[PDB]
Structure formats: C-alpha cells, structure tokens
Amino acid sequence: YSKIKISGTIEVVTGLHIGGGGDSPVVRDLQTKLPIIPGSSIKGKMRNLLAKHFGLKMKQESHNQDDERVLRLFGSSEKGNIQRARLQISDAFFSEKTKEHFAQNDIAYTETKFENTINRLTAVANPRQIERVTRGSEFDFVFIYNVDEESQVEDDFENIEKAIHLLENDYLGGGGTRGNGRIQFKDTNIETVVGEYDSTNLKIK
C-alpha cells in the first residue's frame, strides 16, 4: 500500500472568477482575506471533461454514471459495483511568492471590470461590476493518489495526463466562454509520499 502526491502551481492566464459568495464577490479565506480556488471546482471540471472525452450517452446522461475508467479514477459508490475514489483533490491558496510580487509592485488582488447588457428593441443598457483575480497570479495545489491495485497505475496516470491536457484548454470559474478563467499548469512534481512504489517513470504535463 502506497500513496502518490502530485504538486504544482496553477497560473491564471486571464481573470478567474470562482465567486462562490453569490457586488458579486469572490470566495475568500477568512483567515487572510484572499481569493481561493476550491478543490471541488477543479475536481468537478476534471470529472466533466474526462467523462465527455470518453463515452457519454443519452442513457449515460440520465444518471451521472460514466465510463468505467472515469468512475474508477474519481469514485462513485452509488449503485452495486461501488468504487472508492483513488484520487483526492485539495484546495488552492494564493501563493506566497505572488504575495511578495503584488506587495513590492503594489498590484491589486482583484479587478472590478464593469460590464453591460444591450437588450434588443429598447437598446437600453444595464450596468454591472464583477470581481476577478488579477492576471498572472498563481495558486498552489496538491493531489493525493491512492493505489488500491498494482498494475493499473500507468493507465490511471495516462488518464490523469489526458484530463489535465484537456483542462488546460478550457476554463474554471464562470464566464469562461466570455473570456474569464483560463489557466495553465506548470512546475509539477510526482513523489511517493507514503509506501514503497517508485514514481520516476510517471509524468503529467
């Protein structure tokens, strides 16, 4: 029995707006008054994209069942052949190095870029202001992967690489189709934090 830890940083290519508070603020840790990326959001988008990559049928659309590999990697425990999740996502916190950079260069942590709404036949505008983390900021995340079985490890990491690759060409947060919330992954590290399984041959881009 062993566990594999995945570490890295998520850079916001453009404005990210998680904004679970609902004006229209962003989720903040109440210990440091900072915007965060909840892990469950990351894991849900990975789930959705990876499921859509593999078979996703009408009858599969009905029930939130999905391909055996996706269910195996993310766990269902809903009907009959239940599978305990092998992969645990953690939250992301606004890193310390970006603390230093935005302190030294006096850069705001959250823009308020206004938007509008031109409805038709009246053309009357309607204004709104939303908050989104500033460009270029980085967040630190950590993953933990369980090996309940020995042989499958390579395939699961292949699927993880595929999921990350798809997610890098998509959005987190909201308004993604409208420009917000693009990210890229960088500075990844894979290490066996507990156990006796090697991981030098395993890579996630």
Partner: protein, 117 residues
C-alpha cells in the same frame, strides 16, 4: 443611524431633490468611496495605512471640488455634514469607523435613489 434618512426626508422640497441634485451628479463621489472601500477592505489591521491617509485627503479634495462645481452639490455636502465626519476619520485612524462612514454614504445614496422624481 438613519438620521441620514431623516435629513433626506427633510430635503424633499416642493418636487426637487436637494434643489437640483441628481444621483448621477454623485457618480465621481460614490466611485471614489467604493474605490477606497476596496483598498481598505483588502487591509488587515484597523490601524490605517498612511497612504490611506493620503487617499482620504484626496477624497476630501474631490469633495471640495465637486462642491465648487455645483451649488446643489455644495448644499448636499454641507447640510448632511460629510465634512466633519471625514475630518474626524482622518483624526482617528480607525478602519472599522471608515467602513461605518462607507455604509453611511451608501445609505444616503440608496435612500435618495428611492427618493426621486
């Protein structure tokens, strides 16, 4: 404290609002207070930053200048006593009281908005 509500009711004269004051005359005003609202809500300690003191001074700059432009703005800024409360905030260096002033002005804005032609 709702004394703002009382003054606004006392300011609906036979109708006009503050004798020619409109909410859009207040644009630069609430924009400045909200901008300061963000920069202060980011802060941690109640002991105010001293460029924050400079920013409050700049806010008082905007106040006199708006008053200089329009007579209705002058009447509004004088009777409802923005000016001593800003002075005492500058004298006190307290963040929570700064947000108290912020909701004060926002109360004025909202009540006036419902209190219009």
């Amino acid at each position: 404290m709702t004394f703002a509500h009382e003054v606004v009711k006392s300011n609906v004269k036979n109708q006009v609002l503050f004798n020619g004051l409109t909410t859009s005359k207040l644009r630069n005003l609430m924009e400045q207070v909200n901008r300061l609202y963000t920069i202060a809500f980011n802060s941690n300690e109640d002991q105010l930053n001293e460029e924050f003191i400079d920013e409050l001074e700049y806010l008082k700059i905007k106040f006199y200048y708006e008053a200089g432009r329009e007579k209705s703005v002058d009447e509004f800024l004088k009777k409802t006593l923005m000016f001593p409360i800003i002075d005492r905030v500058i004298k006190k260096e307290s963040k929570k009281f700064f947000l108290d002033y912020c909701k004060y002005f926002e109360a004025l804005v909202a009540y006036a908005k419902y209190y219009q032609k």
